[PDB]
Design an enzyme around this catalytic site. Sequence first.
Site, PDB file in Angstrom:
ATOM      1  N   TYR A  11     -15.128  33.458 -75.005  1.00 60.63           N
ATOM      2  CA  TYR A  11     -15.102  34.535 -76.191  1.00 60.63           C
ATOM      3  C   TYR A  11     -13.735  35.247 -76.330  1.00 60.63           C
ATOM      4  CZ  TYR A  11     -19.879  34.594 -77.516  1.00 60.63           C
ATOM      5  OH  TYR A  11     -21.310  34.214 -77.708  1.00 60.63           O
TER       6      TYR A  11
ATOM      7  N   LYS B 216     -22.752  25.419 -65.182  1.00 63.40           N
ATOM      8  CA  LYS B 216     -22.315  24.027 -65.669  1.00 63.40           C
ATOM      9  C   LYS B 216     -21.320  23.593 -64.447  1.00 63.40           C
ATOM     10  CE  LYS B 216     -23.359  20.110 -67.764  1.00 63.40           C
ATOM     11  NZ  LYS B 216     -24.672  19.315 -67.940  1.00 63.40           N
TER      12      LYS B 216
ATOM     13  N   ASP C  21     -28.373  23.291 -69.252  1.00 67.54           N
ATOM     14  CA  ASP C  21     -29.040  22.070 -70.028  1.00 67.54           C
ATOM     15  C   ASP C  21     -30.511  21.995 -69.429  1.00 67.54           C
ATOM     16  OD1 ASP C  21     -27.778  20.626 -67.507  1.00 67.54           O
ATOM     17  OD2 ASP C  21     -27.694  18.756 -68.895  1.00 67.54           O
TER      18      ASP C  21
ATOM     19  N   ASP D 164     -25.482  34.047 -74.172  1.00 70.18           N
ATOM     20  CA  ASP D 164     -25.741  34.038 -75.616  1.00 70.18           C
ATOM     21  C   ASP D 164     -26.986  32.905 -76.008  1.00 70.18           C
ATOM     22  OD1 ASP D 164     -24.909  34.647 -78.640  1.00 70.18           O
ATOM     23  OD2 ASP D 164     -24.288  32.499 -78.703  1.00 70.18           O
TER      24      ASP D 164
ATOM     25  N   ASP E  67     -31.402  34.023 -76.729  1.00 69.61           N
ATOM     26  CA  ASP E  67     -32.060  33.616 -77.978  1.00 69.61           C
ATOM     27  C   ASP E  67     -33.382  32.725 -77.711  1.00 69.61           C
ATOM     28  OD1 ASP E  67     -30.661  35.481 -79.292  1.00 69.61           O
ATOM     29  OD2 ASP E  67     -29.916  33.837 -80.888  1.00 69.61           O
TER      30      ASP E  67
HETATM   31  C1  IPM Z   1     -22.400  37.830 -83.609  1.00 68.58           C
HETATM   32  C2  IPM Z   1     -22.151  36.894 -82.262  1.00 68.58           C
HETATM   33  C3  IPM Z   1     -20.492  37.061 -82.090  1.00 68.58           C
HETATM   34  C4  IPM Z   1     -22.768  37.482 -81.214  1.00 68.58           C
HETATM   35  C5  IPM Z   1     -22.495  36.759 -79.785  1.00 68.58           C
HETATM   36  O1  IPM Z   1     -22.211  35.451 -79.661  1.00 68.58           O
HETATM   37  O2  IPM Z   1     -22.263  37.443 -78.577  1.00 68.58           O
HETATM   38  C6  IPM Z   1     -24.222  37.162 -81.232  1.00 68.58           C
HETATM   39  O3  IPM Z   1     -24.676  35.904 -81.170  1.00 68.58           O
HETATM   40  C7  IPM Z   1     -25.093  38.301 -79.975  1.00 68.58           C
HETATM   41  O4  IPM Z   1     -26.022  37.203 -79.272  1.00 68.58           O
HETATM   42  O5  IPM Z   1     -25.041  39.243 -80.012  1.00 68.58           O
HETATM   43  C1  IPM Z   2     -24.344  14.838 -65.255  1.00 70.64           C
HETATM   44  C2  IPM Z   2     -23.733  15.747 -66.415  1.00 70.64           C
HETATM   45  C3  IPM Z   2     -22.378  15.487 -66.196  1.00 70.64           C
HETATM   46  C4  IPM Z   2     -24.111  15.392 -67.875  1.00 70.64           C
HETATM   47  C5  IPM Z   2     -23.631  15.952 -69.065  1.00 70.64           C
HETATM   48  O1  IPM Z   2     -23.267  16.987 -68.666  1.00 70.64           O
HETATM   49  O2  IPM Z   2     -23.044  15.148 -69.990  1.00 70.64           O
HETATM   50  C6  IPM Z   2     -25.390  15.439 -68.159  1.00 70.64           C
HETATM   51  O3  IPM Z   2     -26.073  16.543 -68.036  1.00 70.64           O
HETATM   52  C7  IPM Z   2     -26.042  14.694 -69.498  1.00 70.64           C
HETATM   53  O4  IPM Z   2     -26.715  15.217 -70.337  1.00 70.64           O
HETATM   54  O5  IPM Z   2     -25.901  13.395 -69.633  1.00 70.64           O
HETATM   55 MG    MG Z   3     -26.316  35.350 -80.061  1.00 66.38          MG
HETATM   56 MG    MG Z   4     -27.227  17.132 -69.922  1.00 65.46          MG
END
Ligand code: IPM
Ligand code: IPM
Ligand code: MG
Ligand code: MG
Lengths: 364, 364
Positions: B143, B193, B225, B249, B253
Amino acid sequence: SSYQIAVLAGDGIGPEVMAEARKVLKAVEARFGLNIEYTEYDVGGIAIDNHGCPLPEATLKGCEAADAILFGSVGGPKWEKLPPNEQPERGALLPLRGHFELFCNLRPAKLHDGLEHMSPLRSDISARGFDVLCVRELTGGIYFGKPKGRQGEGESEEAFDTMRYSRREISRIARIAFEAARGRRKKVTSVDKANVLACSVLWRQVVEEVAVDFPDVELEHIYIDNATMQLLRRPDEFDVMLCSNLFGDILSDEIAMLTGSMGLLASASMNSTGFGLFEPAGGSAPDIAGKGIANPIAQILSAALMLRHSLKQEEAASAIERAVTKALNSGYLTGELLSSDQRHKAKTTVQMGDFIADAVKAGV
Amino acid sequence: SSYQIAVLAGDGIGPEVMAEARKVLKAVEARFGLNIEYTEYDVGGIAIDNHGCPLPEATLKGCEAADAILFGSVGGPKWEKLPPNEQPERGALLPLRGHFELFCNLRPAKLHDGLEHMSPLRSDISARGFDVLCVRELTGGIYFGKPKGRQGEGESEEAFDTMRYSRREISRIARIAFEAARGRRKKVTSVDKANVLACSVLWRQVVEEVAVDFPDVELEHIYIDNATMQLLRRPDEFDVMLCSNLFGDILSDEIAMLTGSMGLLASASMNSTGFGLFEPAGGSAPDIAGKGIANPIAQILSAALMLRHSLKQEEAASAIERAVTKALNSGYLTGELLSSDQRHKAKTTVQMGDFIADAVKAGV
Ligand SMILES: CC(C)[C@H](C(=O)O)[C@@H](O)C(=O)O
Ligand SMILES: CC(C)[C@H](C(=O)O)[C@@H](O)C(=O)O
Ligand SMILES: [Mg+2]
Ligand SMILES: [Mg+2]
């Protein structure tokens, strides 16, 4: 002429599901008169054990000589003590994607008729169905950007990664998404964080540039945080989702899990000349390896995607897809796709492969 | 002595839910003998309209003079045509977080007894419940990292963002997570990650360093992921989730939506001296603004978090939380929390505020 396939089965269940993919492929070769030769190479965990590294030279050279890579799954407990940066999954996949410039990742996911109840969504949402194709940019962004590393020591030691994208890199993946949308439900949803990231401001801008060539396709933009939420409420309203590297990594796994049926999901990673690497979406499931329980559908559908995108054999690819549909609606299901009061109707990995290969041979 | 609160109600439903938070707060002031003065300032959309920018100088100076910021919601259709980088939400929030060094974001989310059915999860999963506290690092990472921008032109035009973290920045947010875990279910799950990002290798390393001070707390690491998937299958197994800026972030959510009840969710953003900004998790819902439909619970619970973390008034904060519980289990629910065959039992925004304030006054 003879196509050449490099077979990289990897670890865990990879070899046992790969055997079923080969079986099906043999039925397709006979039915369509295709001449395909296969060479097997070590990758991942088995490559570390047998050669000292997850991607041996001999394997890489073998892929260079092939028309496509049919890939299984890599990784397992045994190699997690290695640092996350020397483990087999990253050690095999990042250099393969980098070396072959496999910029385009396609991850199709849909809820199959009759299996809606396996979704972890509330039943009124999963009843509506969904069918989403995730298009993920695979060679740019923060995965490969420089500088990357660390400096300093002690409390002030710092690490850094750089996310970088060029207009050229964005336009080429966006075009793929739009062309795919055109054959599906004519909607692309581009996913970014354009309220924070310079890359995402450029992403959104370039995607709108590309859109002028596709006046028949609807384009919308959504922030990544909001997208994770909207997939839970209205997954049926998405068609093609277009993502940068890291955002696609995240969203594609969310979507995969919403199906409840990861054994059915395949992935294609391709360059602009049609060479690709085709793999199941799920992992190597080392705990079920060797028991004939694993679901070989994902690996079989990987082979179908390979026929289509790399070998340009659409009829052969389609035949596999229909043989899978036949299995699913003839009660040929593996254990993880049954409620466990049904668990004794489960078919084994071999039974699934036999059924599907027989179906192809019967002219499905 | 008199506490000073800066009130930044913002746009959409902000002012109408803020009025109910003030009402409740007046009941708390009387019951506990607190002396609190409030000053109101424009922020967001209304600030662009009235002052030309989303965060006027006068507002910023007003926050500097306060003990805390009680914040509503910002943004709406009217200002989306502005570039995503001049819109009110980013324009107000990033500089506030930056200026006051609000490094720690707490986003508690739980499924409340009796409202499990509003979750978009399958009913057997939502029946188990969950209670997850997301701890998100708010002032570092991608950020605010530099360099950020773009260079070049045409096809080779490129954008870049830099993700950067220092040991010091990681250790301070990790400590907060561990101390929170200690008061909850003694488990921290750190999300990274680390198979791709240098920042995530350092993150994981520093979190393990910090862990030596908390031998009573269980520590696990999960890839971002995979975390998006596991939240769909086993949200009941998580306690404290510890996230970098961008990962938090996204995940926060996802978790918020899994509750199905975003009107119940509040957020705290704090610096190391206890100054903070306290806000509802949801948005400004401009389409329901002015109708007395909006749920004021999230804004009321924001005020409770402010009393606790910034003003050190634990008893007063607790009283609000119990008054909310009383409302929820006395059938005082707003429209979005009822299946729409029930929609005529809905209480209005004012009725909710009156009930909750009366409950506090009655000694709940
Ligand atoms: C508005 C945006 C910059 C903010 C962020 O990404 O932190 C929002 O998505 C949050 O989760 O508060
Ligand atoms: C193993 C890892 C590097 C890979 C990626 O992050 O692309 C995996 O999570 C994917 O989705 O294929
Ligand atoms: Mg957000
Ligand atoms: Mg993946």
